[PDB]
Design an enzyme around this catalytic site. Structure first.
Site, short mmCIF file in Angstrom:
data_model
loop_
_atom_site.label_atom_id
_atom_site.label_comp_id
_atom_site.label_asym_id
_atom_site.label_seq_id
_atom_site.Cartn_x
_atom_site.Cartn_y
_atom_site.Cartn_z
N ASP A 65 0.79 -1.24 0.00
CA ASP A 65 0.00 0.00 0.00
C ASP A 65 0.82 1.29 0.00
O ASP A 65 1.30 1.73 1.05
CB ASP A 65 -0.92 -0.06 1.23
CG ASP A 65 -1.85 1.14 1.34
OD1 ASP A 65 -2.06 1.81 0.33
OD2 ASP A 65 -2.38 1.38 2.43
N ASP A 97 -1.32 5.57 -5.53
CA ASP A 97 -1.75 4.67 -4.45
C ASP A 97 -2.10 3.25 -4.87
O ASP A 97 -3.19 3.00 -5.39
CB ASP A 97 -2.97 5.31 -3.75
CG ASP A 97 -3.48 4.51 -2.55
OD1 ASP A 97 -2.79 3.58 -2.12
OD2 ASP A 97 -4.57 4.83 -2.05
C1 LIG Z 1 -7.17 4.16 0.11
N1 LIG Z 1 -6.55 3.61 1.36
C2 LIG Z 1 -5.27 3.11 1.35
N2 LIG Z 1 -4.49 3.32 0.32
N3 LIG Z 1 -4.79 2.40 2.44
C3 LIG Z 1 -5.66 1.94 3.53
C4 LIG Z 1 -6.35 0.69 3.12
C5 LIG Z 1 -7.17 -0.18 3.92
C6 LIG Z 1 -7.69 -1.27 3.20
C7 LIG Z 1 -7.30 -1.28 1.84
C8 LIG Z 1 -7.70 -2.23 0.81
C9 LIG Z 1 -8.51 -3.36 1.06
C10 LIG Z 1 -8.91 -4.20 -0.01
C11 LIG Z 1 -8.50 -3.89 -1.32
F1 LIG Z 1 -8.89 -4.69 -2.30
C12 LIG Z 1 -7.70 -2.75 -1.58
C13 LIG Z 1 -7.26 -2.40 -2.89
N4 LIG Z 1 -6.89 -2.09 -3.94
C14 LIG Z 1 -7.32 -1.94 -0.51
S1 LIG Z 1 -6.31 0.06 1.55
C15 LIG Z 1 -4.87 1.91 4.83
N5 LIG Z 1 -5.10 3.26 5.39
C16 LIG Z 1 -4.46 3.73 6.55
C17 LIG Z 1 -3.62 2.89 7.33
C18 LIG Z 1 -2.98 3.37 8.50
C19 LIG Z 1 -3.17 4.71 8.90
C20 LIG Z 1 -4.00 5.56 8.14
C21 LIG Z 1 -4.64 5.08 6.98
C22 LIG Z 1 -6.06 4.08 4.63
C23 LIG Z 1 -6.75 3.03 3.78
C24 LIG Z 1 -7.36 3.64 2.48
O1 LIG Z 1 -8.48 4.13 2.48
#
Ligand SMILES: CN1C(=N)N[C@@]2(c3ccc(-c4ccc(F)c(C#N)c4)s3)CN(c3ccccc3)C[C@H]2C1=O
Length: 390
Positions: free
Chosen positions: A36, A232
């Site tokens: 990520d 991202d």
């Molecule tokens: C867009 N995004 C991200 N890039 N990472 C996080 C994600 C969580 C779950 C994700 C996920 C789940 C299933 C999928 F299929 C895909 C895809 N492609 C992505 S991405 C972690 N985060 C975050 C973490 C720690 C501190 C603050 C924020 C903010 C979250 C979020 O909204």
């Protein structure tokens, strides 16, 4: 290709995310971890959950260290809560090193782990500024670089299959490569073009022009980066600011006007299907994003095809039709160049030189008439004005 040990080390697909195998603790506990570039915490499931078949067991690791502090991350795409600590971490198909890193042991979560998916944690590869609870929690990559001789750079090749992968197939298929500490030339064709990392928090960049089949969307370029534009790997779609999304969809509809699609398709909610092999790629336009270059008044462009922005999905009736969902959607938090964009290119996150490189991916999906592209240079003035300031 000089990094054979890391080539083909990813699995997954755009709608599920792409993950790499990692080990945590002593003895090593193997876990699949979502790559990520949109966050900066290394967080792993650390307690039983209906959608996880394995998790980090701190009590079984002799090298586990409790930081005696919690961490809470509010709903974004599910929320989670955990306990901070450190342990020895390695990447089997990566650099041959082991480092001590921070780990957020997830003990409670909501809509975070996905039913049917195969990842048990997330590897946030962005900068400390956006780490939670605060920037004092050193991200994994920073630890890796500080403790070893691994170069401060990683590169990602995410490979969309171009068709649906069932449960068994997505587990057996190679989904891409994460090259830690280098650039593998077998993963791309043509030249690498670099755009500056505007600021080190998310991997922020600046878009200076947008075209739909060569036609300039003609918006004030500040709109393209309102309030930021980031790269991202943890976002499935190409997400665009509201006003930009509105203009782009109108232009994409106009270019593909020989066929009418329901509103639900353009909203990314409903799939559209065609008889096997008859998807009319040619009626859909290519999309070009021009990015600020490294040289003054110079830009370059990355061009994707509908094979990147139409995401293959299985038909509700598991028919023999070829179906897809429109993977461009609106955002209220800026442009997000997600898996849609990344699947067309090999992307180099050159942290050492504060720049992101793009080259045509050796695994991008295309047809006999069109291909994704990375081209330049173009003369472009006042690009600094394209960046947004609060
Ligand atoms: C867009 N995004 C991200 N890039 N990472 C996080 C994600 C969580 C779950 C994700 C996920 C789940 C299933 C999928 F299929 C895909 C895809 N492609 C992505 S991405 C972690 N985060 C975050 C973490 C720690 C501190 C603050 C924020 C903010 C979250 C979020 O909204």
């Amino acid at each position: 290709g000089s990094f054979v040990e890391m080539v083909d080390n990813l699995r997954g697909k755009s709608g599920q995310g792409y993950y790499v195998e990692m080990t945590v603790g002593s003895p090593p506990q193997t876990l699949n971890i979502l790559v990520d570039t949109g966050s900066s915490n290394f967080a792993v499931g650390a307690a039983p959950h209906p959608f996880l078949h394995r998790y980090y067991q701190r009590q079984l690791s002799s090298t586990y260290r409790d930081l005696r502090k919690g961490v809470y991350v509010p709903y974004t795409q599910g929320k989670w809560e955990g306990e901070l600590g450190t342990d020895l971490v390695s990447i089997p198909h990566g650099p041959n090193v082991t480092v001590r890193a921070n780990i957020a042991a997830i003990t409670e979560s909501d809509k975070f782990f996905i039913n049917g998916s195969n990842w048990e944690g997330i590897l946030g590869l962005a900068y400390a500024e956006i780490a939670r609870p605060d920037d004092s929690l050193e991200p994994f990559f920073d630890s890796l670089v500080k403790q070893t001789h691994v170069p401060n750079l990683f590169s990602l090749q995410l490979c969309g299959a171009g068709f649906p992968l069932n449960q068994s197939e997505v587990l057996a298929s190679v989904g891409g490569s994460m090259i830690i500490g280098g650039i593998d030339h077998s993963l791309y064709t043509g030249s690498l073009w670099y755009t500056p990392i505007r600021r080190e928090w998310y991997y922020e960049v600046i878009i200076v022009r947008v075209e739909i089949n060569g036609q300039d969307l003609k918006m004030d370029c500040k709109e393209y980066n309102y309030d930021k534009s980031i790269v991202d790997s943890g976002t499935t779609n190409l997400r665009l600011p509201k006003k930009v999304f509105e203009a782009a969809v109108k232009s994409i509809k106009a270019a593909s006007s020989t066929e009418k699609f329901p509103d639900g398709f353009w909203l990314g909610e409903q799939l559209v299907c065609w008889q096997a092999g008859t998807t009319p790629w040619n009626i859909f336009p290519v999309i070009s994003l021009y990015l600020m270059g490294e040289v003054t008044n110079q830009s370059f462009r990355i061009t994707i095809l509908p094979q990147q922005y139409l995401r293959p999905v299985e038909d509700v009736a598991t028919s023999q039709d070829d179906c897809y969902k429109f993977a461009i959607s609106q955002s209220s938090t800026g442009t997000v160049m997600g898996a849609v964009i990344m699947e067309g290119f090999y992307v180099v996150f050159d942290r050492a030189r504060k720049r992101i490189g793009f080259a045509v991916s050796a695994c991008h999906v295309h047809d006999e008439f069109r291909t994704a592209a990375v081209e330049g240079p173009f003369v472009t003035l006042d690009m600094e004005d394209c960046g947004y300031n609060i």
